[PDB]
Every structure is written in C-alpha cells, then in structure tokens.
Design a protein around this ligand. Structure first.
Ligand code: NAG
Lengths: 99, 35, 49, 106, 49, 50
C-alpha cells in the first residue's frame, strides 16, 4: 500500500469486438421498429445506417453473410436480423436540375 | 500403442484451396486480397 | 544554335532532378527519412509522420 | 425453378440415414425449403434457406442445395420421423412445390 | 488481469515492454476498449501481495 | 527549479526500462521519440535536469 502510484496494482479489463460486416449476437439497448419496404427511409440494420429504398432481394446470401457490398464498398444488400430475409438497398431518388 | 505405418507421394494442387476471404456478399467484381 | 532541342533535354533533366530533391522535404513531418521515423517512433506515431 | 422432381418413397430402418432428394433446373441458384407433412396434419417447415432449421426442429435434420439438386438428410432416422416430406422454391413471387416423399421407418 | 500502474501504457496496440512482449499482446489492428483502474485497496498487503 | 541541476550522461550503456523501478511515475512524456524505442537508439550525450 505504501508504493507510489506507478508502482501500484491496476485492474485491467480489455474488451475486444469485431465491427466488420458479420451476423451479430451482442447489441446495445435499442428498440427495433417495423420493416418498411418500397419507400425512401432512414434505416439502421445492426448499427449499419443509411438512407434508401428497401426491396425484396433474390441475392443468395450464404449463412455467414449479413451484408452485401458494391464496387464502391457501399452496402447495397442486407439480411434482416429478425426475419433473415435478404433486402436490396437502392438510393431514394435524385437527378440534376438545370434552370 | 504404435500400430500405424504411413507412406507418402507427391502430386500437384492445381488451383485448389481458394476460400472466401471475408463474410461480405459480392457479385460481378474482381476482388484483390492478400492472405 | 540548336537551343530548342537542348531546352527540351534540359527541361526534362531539371524536372527529374527537382523530383529527386523533393525527397529531402519534411512536408510537416519530424524527418524526411522514413527509416529514422521508423527507428525513433513506435507504430502509431510513426504512421502519422 | 418450375418443376421440383422428387422420388416417390424412401425406405429406412430405425437408426439409419434417410436421403430425400429434390431436383430442378439450377436449384442450387435459389433458396430451398423443406416441409414435413404427417397424415391428417398441417405441413411443418424443417429446412429453410438451403441448410437452416427452424427452432425446435431436431438437430438430426440437415440439408444442402448444390448444382441442380437439393437433398434432405435425416441421420439416425427415428420412428417419429415417419412423415411426408416436401420441397419448395420461389419463382417470380410464386411458390413452387415438389411431388413429395414418404419416409418409411421400419 | 492485474498489472502495475506504469505498465498500463503497454496495454495498447503497437506497444513493447515486458508485459506487451511476454504476458499480454494486443494486435496492431485492435478494435475495442481498455478499462483500467487502481486497485490498491484490494490487491495490496502490508507484507506485500 | 530556479537553480535546477544538470547532469551529463556519456560513455555508458543506457537501459531505459530500469527507470520505471527508480521512481513511481506513471509514464514518460517524450518529444521527437517514443519511450519504447529509446533502447534501440544511440546519442552523443544525455543531460538529466532535475
Ligand atoms: C445465376 O442464377 C440464375 C438463375 O436461373 C441463372 O440463370 C444464371 O445463369 C446464374 N449465373 C451464373 C453465372 O451461373
């Protein structure tokens, strides 16, 4: 007990986790809403947030796959963590305007 | 109990052994990976 | 007399020499030498430089 | 696809392995679903998305879908497993089923 | 686990030292949190623990 | 601090991992160098101001 601070015992807990795209079993306190398809929505799938339209996908995910990524490494497909269905993500609607 | 005898030869692996590098679905892409 | 052609040669040579001399610039880092940065700092701080 | 071919019956003694096959044009390119129908009973899903079991289905059930054929494998076939097994796939928002197979437990 | 206070800096990616080399090593690409607190009131004894 | 002492360190082998034993400080605060790389380096001189 008489030791200086730098010579005193310290209890250490190291928490290591994975933030890569994968199925998840540990989650924070967060209430889930219903699933809306075919409308432009903000969405949050297991922490992956974005905006776009959700439609039913024919992509055949393997069971270890939760997300699908496009050429620009943007998520364009997601497995729903409750229904386990595969969903396509498409940007809502946009275009240039000239006056 | 030592009771097994083993013989060995040598062959070619061709292009076997490729595995999925991560858990992300991909399609219509050429993906470069170091592993 | 052939000043134009010698000018082409000289411009290319000076461009390459300028490129070589730019390797001694720190660009805001502690050193312009990668080996010194790696020998003096640990991984996390070395990566910034 | 559009026609899920399936053997008419499979004969298995208790404790052995049953292997019910579902075939169809590039069936490995779609998800496969298996249902267990018992006499005078409603259908019961046992396999979804090729190789996944709903909660409560016995650990002995397993499946695969490669090439153009999906198979249902009941290892250690018990007497309860006596039932009629079906094979299903989706096509353009329409559900397609197979003929069916009676798993006989001796 | 338990270490002494001046070794807590070693519980981090990219570190060296006795603890980081021979006892507990974190990867360079570590993703997570390190929680350390003084425990002098439980892990110290008059004669030494 | 007004009459701070300066000591010259030269012609010796410096193991900086032993400094944690002489004083109960929590960590070094270094400049232009990292504490864990000191043992890999050489210096013309060292001065210790206290
Ligand atoms: C992907 O699956 C579809 C389903 O019929 C098939 O028509 C198509 O040829 C498949 N693609 C490849 C590259 O085999």
């Amino acid at each position: 007990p008489t030791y200086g601070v730098g010579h005193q015992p310290y209890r250490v807990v190291v928490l290591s986790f994975e933030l890569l795209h994968a199925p998840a079993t540990v989650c924070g306190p967060k209430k889930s809403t219903n699933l809306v398809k075919n409308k432009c929505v903000n969405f949050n799938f297991n922490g992956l947030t974005g905006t776009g339209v959700l439609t039913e996908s024919n992509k055949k995910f393997l069971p270890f796959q939760q997300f699908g990524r496009d050429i620009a490494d943007t998520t364009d497909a997601v497995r729903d963590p409750q229904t386990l269905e595969i969903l396509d993500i498409t940007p809502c609607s946009f275009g240039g305007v000239s006056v | 109990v030592n009771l097994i005898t083993r013989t060995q030869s040598y062959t070619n692996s061709f292009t076997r052994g490729v595995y999925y590098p991560d858990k992300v679905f991909r399609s219509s892409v050429l993906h470069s990976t170091q592993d | 007399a052939l000043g134009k052609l010698q000018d082409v040669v000289n411009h290319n040579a000076q461009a390459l020499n300028t490129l070589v001399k730019q390797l001694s610039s720190k660009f805001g880092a502690i050193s312009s030498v990668l080996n010194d940065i790696l020998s003096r700092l640990d991984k996390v701080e070395a990566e910034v430089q | 696809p559009s026609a899920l071919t399936q053997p008419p019956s499979v004969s298995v003694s208790p404790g052995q392995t049953a292997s019910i096959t579902c075939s169809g044009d590039k069936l490995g390119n779609k998800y496969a679903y298996w249902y267990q129908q018992k006499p005078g009973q409603s259908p019961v899903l046992v396999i979804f998305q090729d190789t996944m079991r709903p909660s409560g289905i016995p650990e002995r059930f397993s499946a695969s879908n490669s090439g153009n054929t999906a198979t249902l494998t009941i290892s250690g076939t018990q007497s309860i497993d006596e039932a009629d097994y079906y094979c299903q796939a989706w096509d353009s928002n329409t559900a397609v089923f197979g003929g069916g197979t009676k798993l006989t437990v001796l | 686990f338990v270490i002494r206070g001046n070794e807590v800096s070693q519980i981090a990616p990219g570190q060296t030292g006795n603890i980081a080399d021979y006892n507990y090593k974190l990867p360079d690409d570590f993703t997570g949190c390190v929680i350390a607190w003084n425990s002098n009131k439980l892990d110290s004894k008059v004669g030494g623990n | 601090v007004y009459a701070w002492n300066r000591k010259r360190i030269s012609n010796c082998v410096a193991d900086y991992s032993v400094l944690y034993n002489f004083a109960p400080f929590f960590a070094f605060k270094c400049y232009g160098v990292s504490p864990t790389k000191l043992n890999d380096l050489c210096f013309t001189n060292v001065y210790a101001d206290s």
